[PDB]
RNA sequence: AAGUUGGGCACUCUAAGUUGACUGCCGGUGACAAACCGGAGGAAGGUGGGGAUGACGUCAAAUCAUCAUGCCCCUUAUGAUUUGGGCUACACACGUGCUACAAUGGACAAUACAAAGGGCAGCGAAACCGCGAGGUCAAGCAAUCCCAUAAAGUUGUUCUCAGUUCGGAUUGUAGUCUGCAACUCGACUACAUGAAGCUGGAAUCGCUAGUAAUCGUAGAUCAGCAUGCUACGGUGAAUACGUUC
């Protein structure tokens, strides 16, 4: 029983849910083997699937919206955590020792006023 | 009947969205709660100096913010 | 190799194998690429030793001839030195066309630096 | 000489588009507003001591 | 950094390798941004090395990594009152991060006009040696190691 | 550069489509550096310049379509 | 087909109004000195990440051409109004910026995912006539409507290591649009023209995680015309043991 699982990865919303049966995961309609565009390792955001100590426990067909795609992806990665430890709640005490469930490290910031790309300081000439 | 209201101050708008539904829940009036549209800004990058002395400037805004309300049962008590 | 002097390159592509002949290059090359049994297929020096002769027996039905009126540019450009512009003094007295004549480096027209 | 150019400009010398704008309590011709027809260092002062409207500092 | 020892906390799993230090390699021939061209050239030269060497990459790949690996820097130090060198042997998680540099800067050097087949020359002749990057590194191997110097430094 | 007619200044025509009567050669004091050449135009000067030049150009047949009474400079160089 | 049409479903982001981070009970031991390295559970580290905020003062630094201005000069001209030249001129010297020297590259058709913005004579669809720059008409209009397809990348065809199918510098013809008009003095399109150039001497800069680099998006200024400018997202690494210079 896991619903609602949201999923936020820089501008990248995303919203699940989990129905119970096999590791089975879409979005929009569509794959997801051809959809991640480039992404080789779609594998590595089912990787929570892989700590949880068990892969095949419920199917997604899952939503996104928004942001590039590796920005659109791997917060999926995050969305599916929130609503596995609402499938059961013993594990914050037991997907928190990899560290996983959530962080919110970074976005981008600002171009800071006469200056070129937000930290970057243009060349000055001489002395 | 969607009436629309818009101001620069953000709390203004907000006691004036709650004087129009006070004025029409008091009255036999099934409006609904007052509706947040996202609320618009726009931006004046503008340089503080008088003379040439450029890359040392400051920016400027303002900021519109938009309600919505609606009723859907015109009633004598509800008019105006 | 026969269609204005030589032309030269053997073994590429047709299509910009026709490039190297002056007047017709990459986009009418595309167009003027137009007959039965010619289509570029790495067969440059190949393929054709009779269907060649309908792709030049066109080009002489083009009426711009490639290399017969390399003698109207000069009829224009020399027409242009009676002393107008645009032409006139940046060869009677041999600046650049381009708008800047000396802030950047114009050395396009230059000979040096 | 400019306060020739300010009798110039609210009169209309008949072309369509040989007129321009200028600054409303100051005179600048360059970098004037079409918001507020003044201009970016005229504009300032009017900015400061909450006398126009919408204008916070800044910082979003 | 005045202020002491900055954290590491970098990660680096992969898809089908199950090697750690396979995706450093792919984080080094990645310029300028995209990595939506590293992996599609990297895995097609890592399959190409079969069909040109004697075996599978990876038992090939730990030995190329070998051969390759340096021994000895040479941080210079002006001692006590003077002005000369000292060898410094590398602690060892920064040795390998000196090493894959060597492989993809003579991958652009080797003119086998196919950098997915210029690069993988020197995995293969790597676990056999002599290759394009080994000169470098037995020649800077010997750069202090025969020149033993004053090895008491500090730094 | 359009089409519908190559913008002759009016003034000018008038000058010239009553001027061609006669075999006299009084040519121009125009300052108007703007005008095209129409094709009936005779054997005059032109004092096509207004800072200080009246240079008297030639009307001979050029190539006329030129939308310019540009055969006058306007500086030097050496 | 997709209009999200109804249901009126209302939760899921969502869009502007609220609860709570602080060395807190923390283990040490600094001996009680605050504090420092550690462990816990808030999503959260020890000013969570950034801005706005610029102390007494220096440089007789800069501005009378934003305005104000003590004092001296101009007084049928050192004022005034047009037209028309100029601010762009040229053997040269130096700053900043861009686009490139190629095969993890180019061409070619097909092919997905943003943020922030503006638009009531302005933005302009759909279908229409053009090689394109565009021309006509033309409904909808401020989350809803329009500009407005983001682009890089993925899968696939092809050129196969060359002064080259690399690059468009230059140069004539034939147009479009804005305008009273584009010669001095704009911009864009397709037609050929196709130069310099092989990752650059001495030297010299910019950056410590969404950061430099990469292609893009919007805006003001503005009838028309930016590689600059301030804003916005996408892809995203390597490295910092150390204070000797
Ligand atoms: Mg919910
Ligand atoms: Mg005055
Ligand atoms: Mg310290
Ligand atoms: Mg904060
Ligand atoms: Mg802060
Ligand atoms: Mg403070
Ligand atoms: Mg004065
Ligand atoms: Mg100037
Ligand atoms: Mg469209």
């Known amino acids: ?46 990787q929570p699937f892989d700590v949880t100590e068990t892969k095949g426990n419920y199917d997604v067909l899952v939503n996104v919206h928004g942001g590039g795609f590796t920005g659109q992806a791997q917060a999926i990665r995050h969305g599916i955590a929130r609503a596995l430890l609402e499938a059961d709640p013993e594990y914050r005490g037991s997907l928190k020792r990899a560290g996983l469930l959530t962080r919110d490290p970074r976005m981008k910031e600002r171009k800071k006023p006469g200056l070129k790309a937000a930290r970057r300081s243009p060349q000055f000439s001489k002395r | 009947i969607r009436i629309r209201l818009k101001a620069y101050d953000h709390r203004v708008i907000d006691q004036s969205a709650e004087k129009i539904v006070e004025t029409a829940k008091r009255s036999g009036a099934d409006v609904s709660g007052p509706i947040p549209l996202p609320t618009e800004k726009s931006v004046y990058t503008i340089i503080r100096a008088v003379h040439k002395y450029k890359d040392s400037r400051e920016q400027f805004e303002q900021r519109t913010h938009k309600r919505l309300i609606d009723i859907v049962n015109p009633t004598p008590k509800t008019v105006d | 190799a026969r269609i204005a002097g030589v032309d030269i390159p053997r073994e590429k592509r047709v299509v910009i194998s026709l490039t190297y002949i002056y007047g017709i290059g990459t986009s009418t090359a595309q167009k003027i690429l137009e007959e039965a049994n010619v289509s570029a297929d790495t067969r440059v020096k190949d393929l054709t030793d009779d269907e060649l002769g309908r792709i030049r027996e066109v080009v002489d039905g083009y009426k711009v001839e490639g290399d017969l009126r390399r003698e109207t540019n000069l009829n224009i450009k020399r027409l242009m030195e009676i002393s107008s512009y645009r032409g006139i003094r940046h060869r009677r007295g041999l600046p650049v066309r381009g708008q800047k004549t000396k802030n950047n480096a114009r050395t396009r027209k230059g000979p040096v630096k | 000489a400019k306060t020739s150019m300010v009798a110039k400009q609210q009169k209309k010398q008949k072309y369509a ?17 079409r918001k507020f027809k003044l201009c970016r260092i005229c504009f300032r002062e009017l900015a400061y001591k909450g006398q126009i409207p919408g204008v916070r500092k800044a910082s979003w | 950094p005045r202020k002491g020892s900055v954290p590491k906390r970098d990660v680096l799993p992969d898809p089908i390798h199950n090697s ?3 995706t450093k ?14 992996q599609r050239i990297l895995y097609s030269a890592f399959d190409l090395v079969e069909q040109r060497s004697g075996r599978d990459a990876l038992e090939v790949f730990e030995e190329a990594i070998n051969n390759i690996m340096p021994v000895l820097e ?79 430094y500090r730094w | 550069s359009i089409k519908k007619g190559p913008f002759v200044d009016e003034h000018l025509m008038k000058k010239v489509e009553a001027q061609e009567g006669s075999e006299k050669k009084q040519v121009i004091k125009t300052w108007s550096r703007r005008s095209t050449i129409f094709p009936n135009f005779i054997g ?35």
């Open chain 1, 1 to 46: 029983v896991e619903y609602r699982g949201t999923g936020r990865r820089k501008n990248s919303v995303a919203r699940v849910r989990l129905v119970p049966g096999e590791g089975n995961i879409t979005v929009n309609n569509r794959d997801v083997r051809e959809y991640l565009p480039f992404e080789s390792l779609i594998l590595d955001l089912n």
């Open chain 4, 17 to 33: 588009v040989r007129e321009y704008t200028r600054c409303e309590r100051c005179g600048r011709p360059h970098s004037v507003y």
């Open chain 5, 20 to 22: 750690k230090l396979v």
């Open chain 5, 25 to 38: 390699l792919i984080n080094k021939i990645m310029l300028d941004g995209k990595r939506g061209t590293a």
């Open chain 5, 74 to 152: 040479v941080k210079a130090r002006r001692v006590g009152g003077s002005n000369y060198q000292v060898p410094v042997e590398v602690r060892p998680e920064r040795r390998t991060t000196l090493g894959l540099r060597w492989l993809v800067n003579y991958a652009r050097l080797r003119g086998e006009k196919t950098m997915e087949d210029r690069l993988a020359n020197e995995i293969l002749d790597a676990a056999n040696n002599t290759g394009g990057a080994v000169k470098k590194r037995e020649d800077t191997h010997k750069m202090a190691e025969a020149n033993k110097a004053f090895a008491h």
């Open chain 6, 44 to 78: 005059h000067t032109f004092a096509v310049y207004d800072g200080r030049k009246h240079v008297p150009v030639y009307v001979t047949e050029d190539m006329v379509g030129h939308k310019l009474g540009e055969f006058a400079p306007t500086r030097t160089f050496k």
